[PDB]
Structure 1
Amino acid sequence: GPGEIRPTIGQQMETGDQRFGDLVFRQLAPNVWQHTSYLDMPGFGAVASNGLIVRDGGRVLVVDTAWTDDQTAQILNWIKQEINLPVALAVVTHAHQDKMGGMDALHAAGIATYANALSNQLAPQEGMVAAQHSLTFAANGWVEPATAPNFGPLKVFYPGPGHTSDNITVGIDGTDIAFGGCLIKDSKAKSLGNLGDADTEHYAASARAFGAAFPKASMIVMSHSAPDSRAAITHTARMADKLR
């Protein structure tokens, strides 16, 4: 492949990843893949956003869309061509473009979409389309089971306000993988990204709440970095400690 996608922020390509259209796919587990799409900024470079694809028996579950509807449609085509299994549902982590930019692609494909109820409420103001179903959460952050039917190994957890007020996280039961979304940055991150809609008071405790909810997860997946160790949880929690 003469000429590969090398973004300015986000992980770089390496053999073991599979370039598919404008996107990059990396297998993290026998049944878990990471999908990476790129937002080409006008004179700034590609901005990578990561999600996850999970095979649960005869169906496939998706975590987070791509930046655009087109890149999200390419994800579904990669699923049909490489896994050849229907997508049962998708769950998006919060109401920003890198997570809900491709809702129209999922809804055109007939896939049931789930999000935090606050995400569906904030999606109008963020220029996003809400998900079809709303997730609600208990007082300790765990999702109400009645609102997440047939989620399989997807264990959804709301850690509290951090990167946004509505950011949620997803642990993959039966694996050692947990997804932190835009709430967690890698262990060598220089900052905590876009603090525009961030909760600077509760960010630190929300990072640890995510780590305490999945204490056995050794691989942590985030939006704009290669999968890291639990030191990613630690680094951003102490980075957010400086926001006092």
Structure 2
Amino acid sequence: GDQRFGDLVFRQLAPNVWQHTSYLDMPGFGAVASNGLIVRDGGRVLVVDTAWTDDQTAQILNWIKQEINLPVALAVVTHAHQDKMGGMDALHAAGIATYANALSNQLAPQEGMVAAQHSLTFAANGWVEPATAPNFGPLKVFYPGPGHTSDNITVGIDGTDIAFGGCLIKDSKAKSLGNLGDADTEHYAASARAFGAAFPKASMIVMSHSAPDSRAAITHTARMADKLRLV
């Protein structure tokens, strides 16, 4: 069910949702896949996360221009690493309004990232303050607590079965939590649980570095976060 387009891969998840996948091409490591989302909200398109690079991200825009051919209203990027924010310059050159967690925008420079144009803020219960996320359509944005990073945010897609965990969640068969250099190892477990609780009906869990999975990815991630906390 995948379709290669250039160095990119696209996979339809529902009538109006597609997974985009890009691969890091650096002379020192293997072809590391990153997943993001494309959502057709009626007469416009919404993007969750860039690709690794500007060119890869423009390649995303081209696939959208070709296969959907509606204007891209906005993008939301889900934390200040390269696999999520590596392509901001491309989104800006294309006139696309960009959003990130305020904390993500604050960390951007230290991380080598260009900041998003607009900053999301969040209630104590983790739900986005609606005024900071205007006209987000079916995108339901939830900050689950520090985990994979301090800033990681998550997105549910109204009207579908899908919730996007970003790099916070790994699939049910993953061996480890991956690079934990930026990780809050104390809150990770609770933050994964908070994600699953925020989207309790979502049956397809989409993540950054595994194929879509069921809810078992959430509990599996939480357990692995608990095992690590206990050492």
TM-score by length of 1: 0.93
More helix by share: 2
Contact in 2 for aligned 1:170/1:178 (Cα 8 Å):
yes
Report the counterpart of residue 243 of structure 1 in structure 2: 228
Task: Using the TM superposition, give the Cα deviation of residue 43 of structure 1 relative to its aligned residue in structure 2, in angstroms.
Answer: 4.6
2:165 to 168, 180, 183: 180
Off by >6 Å, runs of 4+ in structure 1? none
Query: Identity over aligned residues, as a percent?
Result: 100
Secondary structure, aligned partner of 1:171: strand
1:193-228 superposed Cα distances (whole Å, 9 cap, x missing partner) = 110010000000000000000000000000011100
1:151-190 superposed Cα distances (whole Å, 9 cap, x missing partner) = 0000000000000000000000000100000000000000
CA distance in 2, matches of 1:74, 1:37: 10
Task: Using the TM superposition, give the Cα deviation of residue 45 of structure 1 relative to its aligned residue in structure 2, in angstroms.
Answer: 1.8
1:234 to 206, 219, 223: 219
1:38-74 superposed Cα distances (whole Å, 9 cap, x missing partner) = 0024253200000000000100000000000000000
Return 202-211 or 41-50, whichever deviates more.
Answer: 41-50
How many residues are matched? 229
Task: Using the TM superposition, give the Cα deviation of residue 30 of structure 1 relative to its aligned residue in structure 2, in angstroms.
Answer: 0.3
1:129-155 superposed Cα distances (whole Å, 9 cap, x missing partner) = 000000000001000000000000000
2:95 to 107, 110, 124: 110
In structure 2, list runs of 5 or more residues that go unmatched: none
1:78 to 63, 67, 92: 63
Contact in 2 for aligned 1:156/1:171 (Cα 8 Å):
yes
Contact in 2 for aligned 1:41/1:47 (Cα 8 Å):
no
In structure 1, list runs of 5 or more residues that go unmatched: 1-15
Task: Using the TM superposition, give the Cα deviation of residue 242 of structure 1 relative to its aligned residue in structure 2, in angstroms.
Answer: 1.1
CA distance in 1, matches of 2:55, 2:25: 14
Secondary structure, aligned partner of 1:70: helix
TM-score by length of 2: 0.98
Distance 1:147 1:191, change over 3 A: same
Secondary structure, aligned partner of 1:193: coil
